[model samples]
Target: GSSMKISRGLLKTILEAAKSAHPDEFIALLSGSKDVMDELIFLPFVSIGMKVFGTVHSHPSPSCRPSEEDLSLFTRFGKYHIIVCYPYDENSWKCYNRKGEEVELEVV
Candidate 1:
């Protein structure tokens, strides 16, 4: 894991975009940079904090999932994808990695 923050502006932007475009869909990328000069943390011998691949978004009826379009769009970008369930409910959020495999993430 890496140390960082997602400002309220970005958060609001994402949520507003989703709400205004709900029922169909809306998504965006989370862009950021890290320095090569920075030391890395290795988990299972893999360097950490180096990949800040962006995230994707969508609006749901409290029971929506990754539609075919959603999957395709996310697969089109980022090594990691996070779908934010607005007004989030328990078990409403999820994520996946580059390989298209479902990953377990803390719903914090």
Candidate 2:
């Protein structure tokens, strides 16, 4: 539903959620509004979405991009997806296009 900018507060929430799920994978759907990218308002990701904006899922693995399975599954959902992974201490994330190619994202 939106383009580049993702709210900093939203990112914080994602980081915390991923940390809480520490060592385990966590997945959620993203639903939000798109007007001004920086002001993009999104609810806290659902614990569980065809009417959804996109997806935000975490991986306990060391990578921040999608896996082979992740890439495939994304096609069933949205055009863009976000993955947060690795040691939560580092607080890393990545955004991918449908092709699984990493793209630059601006965190507001």
Candidate 3:
């Protein structure tokens, strides 16, 4: 089965960052080896030699689902994408594939 894993610490970092950027959108690129997403890249020009898996962003609303604008970005990037919404927490985020289909994420 296809799967993705994000470190608990990394997940915390993402959630916190989203919270800090509340009311405004927060976006970051995800990078790691194969299926384990372990790093967040904030600058586009920085190369860390890791394979980018996808992106993670936040929405001001309670909805964590991707928007049309998100779909466009998803297709242009890696296979797995994530969106964390208002009151960001473990339960406030979701993962999706390039096609925008909800996918399971394992917190490691």
lDDT: which candidate is best?
A: 3
Superposed Cα deviation of residue 31, candidate 3 (Å): 0.9
Model 3, residue 46: displacement in angstroms? 17
lDDT of 3 by residue, 59-96 (tens): 98999988898899899978889999988967889999
Q: What is the lDDT of residue 91 in candidate 3?
A: 83
The TM-scores, one per candidate, come to 0.51, 0.74, 0.88
User: Largest TM-score belongs to which candidate?
Assistant: 3
How does residue 48 of candidate 3 score in lDDT? 50
**lDDT rank order:** 3, 2, 1
lDDT assessment of candidate 2 = 0.66
In model 3, which runs have C-alpha deviations exceeding 4 angstroms?
Answer: 43-49
How does each model score on lDDT?
0.51, 0.66, 0.86
Runs in model 2 deviating more than 4 A are 35-51, 89-91
lDDT of 3 at 23: 78
- Candidate 2 per-residue lDDT, tens place, 67-95, comes to 78988867787666788886755358887
Rank by TM-score (best first): 3, 2, 1
Global lDDT of model 3: 0.86
